[PDB]
């Protein structure tokens, strides 16, 4: 047989991971198979952080970064050297990798905004430049859909001023993520400076509606435009990832027109599958 053959065996297919909806391991396994083609492009080359709920969303969960030796040997992996040590992460780059994610009850896949880059001579994978910016728009107390959308459109307009395109993704939880592919990749530190400059410019433009800082007392009635996830040490829920919440909602790509809907809400995994069939990947232009 082939040494590099990728195989995953689904166990406990009937096990309910979302008690509120009765969503099972098998549901999740089929979901990740269903979204593989559109999901993979946006996690390719990135260290994948997992959040796992072995007995579902009403039972304890844990983040996992290092790839355990018990994990399939055929999974791609690469190392990040940080201040305190060294971490070797999985890189999910095949449908069977996503099958492994399902089998792990890794409901959530989280990635940074940079990709590993192979050295010309050595071929060793090392962290490379940011390929895209992400903004996390977190609505504060009492912020309406009209305001959050208004703020998203303001971000998009400022980015267009600098020749960039913006893609909205409702997070699956409470807020809204905006991605923009960089014309020239730049260091994560540089990406973070740029993202910060954008958030501060918007805050200057609409200080009643937007904050660029974490400070808790300034949050009420404002959208927090979080630029800090562009840090190379930070990770953000991957597009098409499930969320480990009461319902199986998804970090779902949207159209700008959809954000114009006052009835805007998070989308469930079944809706996301139907939308892929109809429209393909709304994020097709974000990566590759
Ligand atoms: N403890 C821990 N926290 C993490 C890690 N990676 C990311 N986080 C935090 C920072 C991210 O903002 C967050 C990802 O999911 P959250 O629900 O907290 O933020 P998200 O923007 O997805 O939801 P929202 O739209 O604000 O309701 O988790 C990690 O490895 N360990
Ligand atoms: Mn948020």
From Swiss-Prot:
Q: Which GO terms describe its molecular function?
A: ATP binding; DNA binding; DNA ligase (ATP) activity; DNA ligase activity; DNA-directed DNA polymerase activity; DNA-directed RNA polymerase activity; magnesium ion binding; manganese ion binding
Q: What happens when the gene is disrupted?
A: Not essential for growth, 80% reduction in NHEJ (in strain Erdman).
Outcome after substituting residue 229 to A: Wild-type filling on single nt gaps, impaired gap filling on more complicated templates (in Pol domain)
Biological processes per GO annotation: DNA recombination; DNA replication, synthesis of primer; double-strand break repair; double-strand break repair via nonhomologous end joining
Binding, Mn(2+) 1:
136, 138
Q: Which GO terms describe its cellular component?
A: plasma membrane
Residues of the region (DNA repair polymerase domain (Pol)) are: 8-260
**Stretches for region Not required for ligase activity:** 1-288
Residues involved in substrate binding: 51, 110, 136-138, 171-177, 229, 235, 243
NAD keyword on record: no
Q: Which residues bind DNA?
A: 12-15, 25, 52-54, 62-66, 70, 82-87, 103, 136, 214-219, 226-234
Question: How would you summarize the oligomeric state and partners of this protein?
Answer: Monomer. Component of the NHEJ repair enzyme with mKu. Interacts with Ku in the absence of DSB via the Pol domain. In structures of the Pol domain with template DNA 2 Pol domains are bound to microhomologous DNA complexes to form an end-bridging complex. Probably interacts with Mycobacterium phage Omega and Corndog Ku homologs (AC Q853W0, AC Q856K7). Interacts with Sir2; may form a trimeric complex with LigD during NHEJ.
Record text about domains: The N-terminal Mn(2+)-dependent polymerase/primase domain (Pol) functions as an independent domain, binds DNA, is sufficient for DNA-directed and non-DNA-directed DNA synthesis and interacts with Ku. The central 3'-phosphoesterase domain (PE) has exonuclease activity probably constituted of 3'-ribonuclease and 3'-phosphatase activity. It does not function as an independent domain.
Further facts? LigD has variable architecture; domain order can be permutated, domains can be independently encoded, while some bacteria lack the 3'-phosphoesterase domain entirely.
Q: Which family does it belong to?
A: In the N-terminal section; belongs to the LigD polymerase family.
Protein role: With Ku forms a non-homologous end joining (NHEJ) repair enzyme which repairs DNA double-strand breaks (DSB) with reduced fidelity. Recognizes, processes and reseals DSBs, including repairs on incompatible DSB which require 3'-resection, gap filling and ligation. Anneals the 3' overhanging strands from opposing breaks to form a gapped intermediate, which then can be extended in trans by using the termini as primers for extension of the annealed break.
Q: What is this protein called?
A: Multifunctional non-homologous end joining DNA repair protein LigD
Please name the taxonomic classification of the source.
Bacteria, Bacillati, Actinomycetota, Actinomycetes, Mycobacteriales
Q: Which gene encodes it?
A: ligD
Boundaries of the shown chain within the full protein: 2 to 289 of 759
């Amino acid at each position: 047989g082939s040494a590099s053959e990728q195989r995953v065996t689904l166990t406990n297919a009937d096990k309910v991971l979302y008690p509120a909806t009765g969503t099972t391991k098998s549901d999740i396994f089929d979901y990740y198979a269903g979204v593989a083609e559109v999901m993979l492009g946006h996690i390719a080359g990135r260290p994948a952080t997992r959040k796992r709920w072995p007995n579902g969303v009403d039972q304890p969960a844990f983040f996992e970064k290092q790839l355990a030796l018990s994990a399939p040997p055929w999974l791609s992996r690469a190392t990040v050297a940080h201040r305190s040590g060294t971490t070797t992460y999985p890189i999910i780059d095949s449908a069977t990798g996503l099958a492994w994610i399902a089998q792990q009850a890794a409901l959530e896949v989280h990635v940074p905004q940079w990709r590993f880059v192979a050295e010309p001579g050595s071929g060793e994978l090392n962290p490379g430049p940011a390929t895209r910016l992400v903004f996390d728009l977190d609505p504060g107390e009492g912020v309406m859909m009209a305001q959050l959308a208004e703020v998203a459109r303001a971000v998009r307009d400022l980015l267009a001023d600098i020749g960039l395109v913006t893609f909205p993704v409702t997070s699956g939880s409470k807020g809204l993520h905006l991605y923009t592919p960089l014309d020239e990749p730049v260091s994560s530190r540089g990406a973070t400076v740029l993202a910060k400059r954008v958030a501060q410019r918007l805050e200057q433009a609409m200080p009643a509606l937007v904050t660029s800082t974490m400070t808790k007392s300034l949050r009420a009635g404002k959208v927090f435009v979080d630029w800090s996830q562009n840090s190379g040490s930070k990770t953000t829920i991957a597009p098409y990832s499930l969320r480990g919440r009461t319902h199986p909602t998804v970090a779902a790509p949207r159209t700008w027109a959809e954000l114009d809907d006052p009835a805007l809400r998070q989308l469930s995994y079944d809706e996301v599958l139907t939308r892929i069939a109809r429209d393909g990947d709304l994020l097709e232009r974000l990566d590759a």
